[PDB]
Design a binder for this molecule. Structure first.
Ligand SMILES: O=C(O)CC[C@@H](CC(=O)O)C(=O)O
Length: 499
C-alpha cells in the first residue's frame, strides 16, 4: 500500500479540538483544520479560506472574501456564519487565549454576505494576518459540533475543511487519518496515515528498523541521538537534521530564593559547561545557545555578551553575594541556609534527566546543591503557572512565534515565563515594552524595543540558554526528501510524494 504510510508519535492526537491546547497535538490540529490566511516561509502570507480581503483606511476593520467552493468535511458548508461562530466560540474563552495578543484585540466579528466576513479590532494590529495563520485557536470546526454553543467545554466530532480526516482514534495505540476526498485544494498523494503511539525513543528506533514505520518526524527527542547518528550512516535509511528552529534552556525563578538573587543566577550561568553538556547529552548533534534567541532570529542579532564556562568566576560572584563555605561542608550557606535549588523536569524524559544530572554535578562544583524533581508532565506544566520551581527546562516555539508571540506570552500570568520574571524590578517595564513592540508600525521603534527587552531579560540572567535544537527525520528512501513546514509545529504530510 504506497498510497498509505505509517508513522509514530509519543502520544495520541487528542480530541482535535481546534480551539484548545493540551493535549491537542498541534501538527494534528493543523492536519484537520485550516486558517483564513496561510503562512509563508518568506514570513508573508497568501490567501487560503479567505479568497482575498479588504481593510478600513484606519486599519481597524477588515472584511474577508471567503471561498464559496469549500465544503466542510461532513458535506456541510463553510461560510462566514460558521466562521463568525468559531471566532465567537474562541473568544468566549478569550481569557486563556490571552497569550496571543490577537485574542484580546478582536472587538467583534459578524457575518455580512453569505461569504463576506468583517473583523474590527481595537487597533490597527500589524500581527493580525500572520497571527490568524497560526495552527490555533483561529482555525475552524463545523458549528454543528459544539457542546451547546461552546467549544471551550468540548466539541462533538473533529470535523474541518483540512485534507485529512481523523477516521479513527484508539487510546494508547494509534490514530488514523484518511485523505479528505472532498477537499477544496490539491489532492494529497497519500490517502491514509497511521500514527502509532510509542512513548520510548529507543522503541521508536526499533519500530522503524522492523520496516513497519515509514517515517519519523519530530525534534531532538525523536529517537536516541547516537542511534540517529548510526542511522544517518546507513545506506538503506534516510535521515535529515534541519537547521535550528527554537532554543531550549532553563528558566530561573527570580521571584524565589535563592534564584531571587542576580548573583546566584549569573553564577549558575558561568558554572555550566554547555559544550560538554551538548556533546555528551545531545551527541554533538545540536548547537550551543548563548542567548534566549539565536542571532538569526529577526530582531535578535543584538551583540549580547555570552556567559562562558568559568567555575572560577562562578564561585567568586557567589561568595561576594554572601554565600560562603562552612567548615566541613561542600555546599554554601547564607545566614544559615544552604544554597539549595530544585530543578523540575519530566521524570520520564531521558533527555531532560541527562542534562539535569550534568547540570546538577556542574553546580555542585560551585557550592550549590540542586535537587532533581522528575515528575509527571501534568505536575510540571502545573508548577509553571503556579511558579513552584527553582530552575525549569523550557523552550521557545520556532517560527513564526519567535520572537513576537513568545514575548507577548511573557505578559500573561498564566505561564512559566511570566512566573520566572515575576521577581524582577524590570517586569512592569518589560511587559510595557512588549505591548509596545506589538503595537508599533515603525521598524526602527520596533528594533529598539526588542533590543531593550531582550537585553534586560539577558542581563538580568532570567534564563540559562543551553542549545538551539533541530528537527530530525528518519524515513524509508522511497518517500524521497521530507519537506519542512514554514510553521515549525506542523508536519507537511500533503507534500510527501511516495513511489
Ligand atoms: O499552541 C499554541 O499555539 C501555543 C501554546 C503554547 C503554550 C500556551 O500559550 O498555552 C506552547 O506551549 O507552544
Amino acid at each position: 500500500a504506497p498510497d498509505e504510510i505509517t508513522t509514530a508519535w509519543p502520544v495520541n492526537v487528542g480530541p482535535l479540538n481546534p480551539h484548545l491546547y493540551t493535549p491537542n497535538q498541534m501538527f494534528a490540529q493543523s492536519m484537520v483544520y485550516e486558517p483564513l490566511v496561510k503562512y509563508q516561509a518568506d514570513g508573508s502570507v497568501i490567501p487560503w479560506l479567505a479568497k482575498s480581503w479588504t481593510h478600513s483606511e484606519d486599519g481597524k476593520t477588515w472584511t474577508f472574501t471567503l471561498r464559496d467552493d469549500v465544503k466542510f468535511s461532513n458535506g456541510e458548508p463553510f461560510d462566514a456564519e460558521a466562521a463568525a461562530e468559531n471566532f465567537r466560540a474562541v473568544l468566549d474563552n478569550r481569557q486563556r487565549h490571552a497569550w496571543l495578543e490577537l485574542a484580546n484585540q478582536i472587538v467583534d466579528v459578524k457575518a455580512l454576505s453569505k461569504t463576506e466576513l468583517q473583523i474590527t479590532l481595537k487597533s490597527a494590529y500589524y500581527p493580525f494576518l500572520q497571527e490568524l495563520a497560526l495552527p490555533r485557536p483561529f482555525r475552524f470546526i463545523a458549528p454543528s459540533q459544539f457542546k451547546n454553543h461552546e467549544t471551550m467545554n468540548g466539541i462533538k466530532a473533529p470535523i474541518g475543511t483540512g485534507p485529512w480526516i481523523l477516521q479513527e482514534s484508539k487510546l494508547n495505540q494509534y490514530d488514523v487519518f484518511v485523505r479528505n476526498e472532498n477537499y477544496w485544494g490539491e489532492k494529497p498523494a497519500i490517502k491514509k496515515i497511521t500514527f502509532n503511539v510509542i512513548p520510548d525513543p529507543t522503541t521508536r528506533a526499533v519500530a522503524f528498523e522492523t520496516g513497519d514505520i515509514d517515517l519519523l518526524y519530530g525534534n531532538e527527542g525523536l529517537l536516541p541521538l547516537d542511534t540517529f547518528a548510526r542511522f544517518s550512516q546507513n545506506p538503506a535509511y534516510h535521515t535529515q537534521l534541519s537547521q535550528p528552529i527554537e532554543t531550549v534552556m532553563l528558566a530561573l525563578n527570580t521571584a524565589k530564593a535563592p534564584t531571587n538573587e542576580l548573583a546566584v543566577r549569573e553564577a549558575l550561568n558561568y558554572a555550566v559547561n554547555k559544550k560538554s553538556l551538548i556533546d555528551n547529552a545531545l551527541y554533538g548533534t545540536q548547537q550551543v545557545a548563548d542567548t534566549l534567541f539565536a542571532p538569526s532570529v529577526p530582531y535578535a542579532n543584538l551583540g549580547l555578551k555570552p556567559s562562558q564556562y568559568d567555575p572560577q568566576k562562578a564561585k567568586a560572584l557567589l561568595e561576594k553575594a554572601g554565600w560562603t563555605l562552612p567548615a566541613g561542608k561542600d555546599i554554601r550557606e547564607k545566614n544559615g541556609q544552604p544554597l539549595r535549588i530544585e530543578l523540575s523536569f519530566i521524570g520520564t524524559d531521558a533527555l531532560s534527566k541527562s542534562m539535569a544530572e550534568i547540570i546538577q554535578a556542574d553546580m555542585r562544583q560551585i557550592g550549590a546543591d540542586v535537587s532533581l524533581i522528575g515528575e509527571e508532565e501534568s505536575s510540571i506544566y502545573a508548577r509553571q503557572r503556579d511558579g513552584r520551581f527553582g530552575m525549569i527546562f523550557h523552550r521557545t516555539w520556532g517560527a513564526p512565534y519567535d520572537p513576537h508571540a513568545f514575548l507577548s506570552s511573557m505578559r500573561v500570568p498564566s505561564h512559566a515565563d511570566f512566573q520566572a520574571q515575576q521577581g524582577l524590578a524590570d517586569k512592569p517595564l518589560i511587559d510595557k515594552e512588549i505591548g509596545e513592540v506589538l503595537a508599533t508600525h515603525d521598524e526602527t521603534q520596533r528594533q529598539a524595543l526588542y533590543r531593550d527587552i531582550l537585553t534586560r531579560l539577558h542581563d538580568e540572567a532570567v534564563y540559562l540558554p543551553i542549545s538551539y535544537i533541530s528537527m530530525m527525520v528518519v524515513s524509508k528512501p522511497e518517500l524521497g526528501n521530507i519537506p519542512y513546514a514554514p510553521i515549525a509545529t506542523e508536519i507537511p504530510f500533503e507534500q510527501i510524494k511516495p513511489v
